[PDB]
Amino acid sequence: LPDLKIEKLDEGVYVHTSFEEVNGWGVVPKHGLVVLVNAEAYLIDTPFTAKDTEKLVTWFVERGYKIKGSISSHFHSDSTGGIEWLNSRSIPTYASELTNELLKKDGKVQATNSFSGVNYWLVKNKIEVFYPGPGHTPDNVVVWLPERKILFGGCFIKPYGLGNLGDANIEAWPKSAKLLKSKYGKAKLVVPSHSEVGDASLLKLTLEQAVKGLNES
Amino acid sequence: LPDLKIEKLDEGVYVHTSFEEVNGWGVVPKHGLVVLVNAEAYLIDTPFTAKDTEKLVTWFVERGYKIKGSISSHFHSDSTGGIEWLNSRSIPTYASELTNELLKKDGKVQATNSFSGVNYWLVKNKIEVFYPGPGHTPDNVVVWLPERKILFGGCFIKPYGLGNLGDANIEAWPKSAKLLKSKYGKAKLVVPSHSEVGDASLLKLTLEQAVKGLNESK
Numbered sequence: 150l151p152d153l154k155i156e157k158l159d160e161g162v163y164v165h166t167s168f169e170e171v172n173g174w175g176v177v178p179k180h181g182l183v184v185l186v187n188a189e190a191y192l193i194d195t196p197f198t199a200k201d202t203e204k205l206v207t208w209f210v211e212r213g214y215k216i217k218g219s220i221s222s223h224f225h226s227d228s229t230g231g232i233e234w235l236n237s238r239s240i241p242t243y244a245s246e247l248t249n250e251l252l253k254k255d256g257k258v259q260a261t262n263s264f265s266g267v268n269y270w271l272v273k274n275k276i277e278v279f280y281p282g283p284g285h286t287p288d289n290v291v292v293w294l295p296e297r298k299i300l301f302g303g304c305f306i307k308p309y310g311l312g313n314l315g316d317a318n319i320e321a322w323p324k325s326a327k328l329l330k331s332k333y334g335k336a337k338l339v340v341p342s343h344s345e346v347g348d349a350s351l352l353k354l355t356l357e358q359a360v361k362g363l364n365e366s
Numbered sequence: 367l368p369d370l371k372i373e374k375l376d377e378g379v380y381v382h383t384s385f386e387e388v389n390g391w392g393v394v395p396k397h398g399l400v401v402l403v404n405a406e407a408y409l410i411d412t413p414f415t416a417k418d419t420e421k422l423v424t425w426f427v428e429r430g431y432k433i434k435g436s437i438s439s440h441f442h443s444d445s446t447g448g449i450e451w452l453n454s455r456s457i458p459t460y461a462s463e464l465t466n467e468l469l470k471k472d473g474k475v476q477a478t479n480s481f482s483g484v485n486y487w488l489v490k491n492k493i494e495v496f497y498p499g500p501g502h503t504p505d506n507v508v509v510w511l512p513e514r515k516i517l518f519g520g521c522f523i524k525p526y527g528l529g530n531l532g533d534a535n536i537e538a539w540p541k542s543a544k545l546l547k548s549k550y551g552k553a554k555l556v557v558p559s560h561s562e563v564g565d566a567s568l569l570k571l572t573l574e575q576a577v578k579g580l581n582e583s584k
């Protein structure tokens with residue numbers, strides 16, 4: 150129910166929070182980012198709804214920033230909710246190939262541009278996308294911002310509990326978390342989708358929950 | 367929904383973590399400490415509920431420790447949630463004079479013992495309470511453990527964002543963070559209520575947030 154929030158996180162980096170009812174978890178807040186790249190902006194994950202997606206887009210257009218593109222970390226509606234609206238406005242949308250396949254599998258609108266592999270540059274030297282392997286979902290990817298040493302973990306970063314295991318790969322999660330931790334331990338900030346912001350320690354906490362998660366199975 | 371956990375942070379120093387839903391912030395983790403003193407133990411902040419408080423108290427008595435007393439960093443329930451139970455079970459509870467006055471204004475059970483001023487020693491040469499001035503709340507105070515160079519920052523230490531500003535004093539917070547920074551810049555470990563443990567750098571980060579808070583508010 151709470152209204153969308155837009156808080157500046159660091160120079161050129163904003164955190165947008167939307168809220169929505171989630172079967173069994175009640176009202177859950179979702180964090181995404183809006184990266185500024187020379188008068189232009191990029192959305193890292195869309196708000197749950199098309200309305201909040203537009204409010205977000207509009208908020209930044211009024212501040213002088215054209216929306217150059219949007220990237221979704223995984224297929225769950227809390228990262229892809231506003232893709233139909235964005236595409237209708239001809240705004241470039243991106244998602245991994247695995248993500249679009251899952252979106253198509255569940256009867257959802259897909260991103261216009263796909264990509265795959267270990268690393269992919271949405272924007273050279275400014276916005277990099279990394280795939281640690283299956284965990285929260287088979288397709289989950291993270292977003293790295295070299296300049297600000299900021300990492301958007303999305304729904305892969307689950308420091309206090311693995312949450313929604315509906316599409317989780319609990320067998321692979323610990324291996325994927327190990328990979329992510331050694332790759333971005335240099336992170337100054339880690340932004341989770343459902344937890345508050347922290348540092349590189351959130352990578353360790355996630356690894357422990359995953360490990361715990363598999364043992365616990 | 368996540369269960370209460372008690373992890374050893376140092377020698378004679380544990381970190382208790384409890385969770386609870388908070389409108390607008392989701393499932394919020396809450397850190398508090400448990401300092402040991404000769405088979406005795408003091409509670410730094412209490413879990414949200416009486417039940418968690420009970421499990422906490424037990425885990426330690428169960429280990430052969432007497433619960434000498436408890437102290438709450440500020441009035442929000444994530445610090446005073448179990449004062450009712452601690453009093454019921456006749457256990458020494460402490461809260462600042464301003465804290466007990468706010469608890470009383472909010473129709474909440476107060477702490478048996480109060481205290482005022484800048485510095486107050488819950489335990490001389492071992493446990494000290496300090497009041498940096500208004501910030502996260504008009505009453506927030508911190509706890510310093512001299513014998514370990516460990517400072518429990520409380521909900522005043524908000525290194526990556528100020529958080530729930532409902533009772534925050536935005537104008538005063540930056541000066542208080544300044545005072546706090548210098549006063550305890552010699553900390554080896556700063557423990558936040560809602561973030562992971564770190565070192566003195568968290569004092570710097572908090573100040574920056576506060577300042578960005580006041581500038582961002584005018």
Ligand SMILES: *C(=O)CCSC(=O)CC[S-]
Pocket residue numbers: 171174177225226227304311312313314343
């Ligand atoms: C973590 O998964 C907590 C539940 S929020 C949710 O399930 C939305 C899709 S990740």
Ligand SMILES: *C(=O)CCSC(=O)CC[S-]
Pocket residue numbers: 388391394442444521528529530531560
């Ligand atoms: C910091 O305030 C994060 C939210 S926790 C809260 O608002 C209740 C205890 S201060």
Ligand SMILES: [Zn+2]
Pocket residue numbers: 223225285286304
């Ligand atoms: Zn998800």
Ligand SMILES: [Zn+2]
Pocket residue numbers: 179225227303304342343
């Ligand atoms: Zn999610």
Ligand SMILES: [Zn+2]
Pocket residue numbers: 440442502503521
């Ligand atoms: Zn508080």
Ligand SMILES: [Zn+2]
Pocket residue numbers: 442444520521559560
């Ligand atoms: Zn708090």
